[PDB]
Design a protein around this ligand. Structure first.
Ligand SMILES: CO[C@H]1O[C@H](CO)[C@@H](O)[C@H](O[C@H]2O[C@H](C)[C@H](O)C[C@H]2O)[C@@H]1O[C@H]1O[C@H](CO)[C@H](O)[C@H](O)[C@H]1O
Lengths: 212, 211
């Protein structure tokens, strides 16, 4: 049916005003689409914010307001607070289905940005004895919590065999993620340099090792 | 106040059927809709359908009409959703939410995780990750089902510990944990990770030894 589109990520500072939009592939969002906005915080904590285009849910702060701005539904946070850092989903009632946008991750900078500490570990001998090899790349302490991870084996991009977790908020509220490259020991033995490349805010950190 | 209480975690095998429930607290059940939401790992949120208990009207997403059956028992103020013929694609966290005019979910339940797997209980293989401040790790590979608990030096090492979320590799989970200690500390001070996998009563300790 319709495809509802939201910005994927926005960053602001405490006390600033930020507007998030929600649009449809059917053309304009109207009042009969009853635009809804909800917030997702860590550990599956969801809060309804806005219902029926502009009604604040019970006990939602007045700094959150919803409106139709032109052909789009929008959520404006007038005077953003550090605790508003979360993912915001809008949904539209269309053809008797609630259709969800992809969610906007909103960073509200409550501390200075921080680059990732990347550590890459080689396979342990005890795992190589099983005929398997996992390289582990741990990525911690980054803020904002958005990072891309890329693996290279002897310079060729790896697109099969790696798993990367979604960023978890650490206790200090910076974020962490790991990535795994699993290979058979035979495959491990055919290559020499392995790299884990992490791009955070336009800059890349790279950690490489050589089998040897 | 208003509370939406959900049932617990479910583990089910392919082909089966499960029933999940949401109990309302703090409001008149018969004046509100109960909606059900599916959240997949990284697939976003999907609306399954809604039931209006007061007169048992329902709306279903066409895509879930062959999968779901929504019911509600007004005397028990409970809504249920039964999912049939479970595939792996049904593993997700399900939420029930309270709705009314123009909205589906001002209050949300806490979620109920459903995992659909053919796998059997498997204990973790624990592998020490040495470099050769220093960061040491432990890889906890190939266990089913979730969870495992990781401590370092029986809980004494608590600062600078990071345990990452499990990924699924094949139909078994893998997770790792790192601890960063001052470089003078290691190897003089022994560092051991402790892994417990309650589902197979596995408890294993791994001393990190330099390479
Ligand atoms: C059966 O209930 C319909 O009428 C009531 C009374 O006005 C609406 O509030 C209902 O809509 C709510 O519940 C559904 C499940 C959605 O969550 C949207 C909510 O507003 C429902 O009406 C909807 O469907 C009708 C079809 O008759 C129209 O689309 C209307 O615009 C909707 O509100």
């Amino acid at each position: 049916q319709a495809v509802v589109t939201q910005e994927s990520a926005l960053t602001t500072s405490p006390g600033e005003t930020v507007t998030l939009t929600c649009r449809s592939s059917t053309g304009t969002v109207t009042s009969g689409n009853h635009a809804n906005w909800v917030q997702e915080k860590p550990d599956h904590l969801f809060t309804g914010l806005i219902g029926d285009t502009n009604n604040r849910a019970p006990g939602v702060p007045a700094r959150f307001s919803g409106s139709l701005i032109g052909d789009k539904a929008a959520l404006t946070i007038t005077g953003a607070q550090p605790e508003d850092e979360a993912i915001y989903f809008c949904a539209l009632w269309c053809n008797n289905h609630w259709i969800f946008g992809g969610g906007t991750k909103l960073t509200v900078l409550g501390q200075p940005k921080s680059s990732p500490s990347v550590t890459l570990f080689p396979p342990s001998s005890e795992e190589l004895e099983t005929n398997k090899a996992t390289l582990v790349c741990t990525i911690t302490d980054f803020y904002p919590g958005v990072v891309t991870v890329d693996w290279k084996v002897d310079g060729t991009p790896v697109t099969q065999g790696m798993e990367t977790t979604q960023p978890s908020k650490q206790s200090n509220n910076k974020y962490m993620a790991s990535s795994y490259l699993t290979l058979t020991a035979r495959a491990w033995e055919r290559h020499s340099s392995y790299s884990c490349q992490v791009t955070h805010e336009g800059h890349t950190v790279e950690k490489s090792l050589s089998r040897a | 106040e208003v509370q939406v209480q959900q049932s617990g975690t479910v583990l089910a095998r392919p082909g089966a059927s499960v029933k999940m429930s949401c109990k309302a607290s703090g409001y008149t059940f018969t004046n509100y809709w109960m909606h059900w939401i599916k959240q997949r790992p990284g697939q976003g949120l999907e609306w399954i359908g809604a039931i209006y208990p007061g007169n048992s009207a329902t709306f279903y997403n066409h895509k879930f009409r062959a999968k779901t059956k929504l019911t509600a028992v007004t005397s028990t103020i409970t809504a249920y959703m039964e999912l049939s013929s479970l595939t792996n694609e049904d593993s997700a966290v399900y939420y029930c939410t309270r709705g009314g005019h123009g909205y589906y979910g001002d209050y949300w339940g806490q979620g109920a995780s459903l995992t659909v797997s053919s796998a059997k209980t498997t204990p973790p293989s624990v592998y020490p990750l040495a470099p050769g401040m220093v960061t040491l790790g432990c890889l906890v590979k190939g266990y089913f089902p979730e969870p495992v608990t990781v401590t370092w030096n029986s809980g004494s090492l608590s600062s600078g510990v990071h345990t990452f979320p499990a990924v699924l590799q094949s139909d078994l989970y893998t997770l790792s944990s790192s601890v960063t200690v001052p470089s003078s500390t290691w190897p003089s001070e022994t560092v051991t990770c402790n892994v417990a996998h309650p589902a197979s009563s596995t408890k294993v300790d791994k001393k990190i030894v330099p390479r």
